[PDB]
């Protein structure tokens, strides 16, 4: 299937309580492999997956210096954005950055992205061609022209189409026994009557990887998303994920409703009945 390497940057300003806090994490598909916390004692990039540990000391020193450098730039950014919007120094603000590359089944470059957010809302993001910018407001227009004079998009594209695909391939090979497994979900069905004549049909999917999955509740064989409840996919904590979907029905009529499981680790999509 497909694969992705993504990095996430966060920096929260704390007026009156010191420097802003910087947190950075890196992901390979739904598997986190590194982290940095500017508030920790480590003051170093740290492994968070077994397959990344084999990288030598030159790797960890280089990732620490840059995440330290990106730390400070996002510190300056909080002041710059505070000026762009004429905000006061008293409030706490959030700045977020995400970038990464996507590759297909043949592990060849498929998609790149580089985005930036301020206080949870879109600010600036690299367009799909990796040559142009999407600016959200007039302050992001200043950033856009600033980065156009600095040729930022051209230098990001060289990384996202080169370095990021090649190091993602390296991780995928070096961690094949973990990153390339496909845990098929284990599915069962709970029953919990609500009310005399209506009762919940909850379709369960447990212990699957990767996180992507599709659960649908049908009527007679055709779907009905009227009484369907659907929780967000959640981590089980041991590397796998969980999800369920529920519906209410009239009683004695519980076996017109079917549940359909779609997952890459399933050769056949599953149907369940009661």
């Amino acid at each position: 299937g497909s694969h992705s390497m993504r990095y996430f940057f966060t920096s929260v300003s704390r007026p009156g309580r010191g420097e802003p806090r910087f947190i950075a994490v890196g992901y390979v598909d739904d598997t986190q492999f590194v982290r940095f916390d500017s508030d920790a004692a480590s003051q170093r990039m740290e492994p968070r997956a077994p397959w990344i540990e084999q990288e030598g000391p030159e790797y960890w020193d280089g990732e620490t210096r840059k995440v330290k450098a990106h730390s400070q730039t996002h510190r300056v950014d909080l002041g710059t954005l505070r000026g762009y919007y004429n905000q006061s120094e008293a409030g706490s603000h959030t700045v977020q950055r995400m970038y990464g590359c996507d590759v297909g089944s043949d592990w060849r470059f498929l998609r790149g992205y580089h985005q930036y957010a301020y206080d949870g809302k879109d600010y600036i993001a690299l367009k799909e061609d990796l040559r142009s910018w999407t600016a959200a407001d007039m302050a992001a227009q200043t950033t856009k022209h600033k980065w156009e004079a600095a040729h930022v998009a051209e230098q990001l594209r060289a990384y996202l189409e080169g370095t990021c695909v090649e190091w993602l391939r390296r991780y995928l090979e070096n961690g094949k026994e973990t990153l390339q497994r496909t845990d098929a979900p284990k599915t069962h069905m709970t029953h919990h009557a609500v009310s005399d004549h209506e009762a919940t049909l909850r379709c369960w999917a447990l212990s699957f990887y990767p996180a992507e999955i599709t659960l649908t509740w049908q009527r007679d064989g055709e779907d009905q998303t009227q009484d369907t409840e659907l929780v967000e996919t959640r981590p089980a904590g041991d590397g796998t994920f969980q999800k369920w979907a529920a519906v209410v029905v009239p009683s004695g009529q519980e076996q017109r409703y079917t549940c359909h499981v779609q997952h890459e680790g399933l050769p056949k999509p599953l149907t369940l009945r009661w």
Binding site: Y7, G26, Y59, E63, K66, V67, A69, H70, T73, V76, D77, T80, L81, Y84, Y99, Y116, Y123, I124, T143, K146, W147, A150, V152, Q155, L156, Y159, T163, C164, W167
Partner: peptide
């Protein structure tokens, strides 16, 4: 692996 380029908003 991180990208080295430092960018300022």
């Amino acid at each position: 692996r991180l990208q080295s380029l430092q960018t300022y908003v």
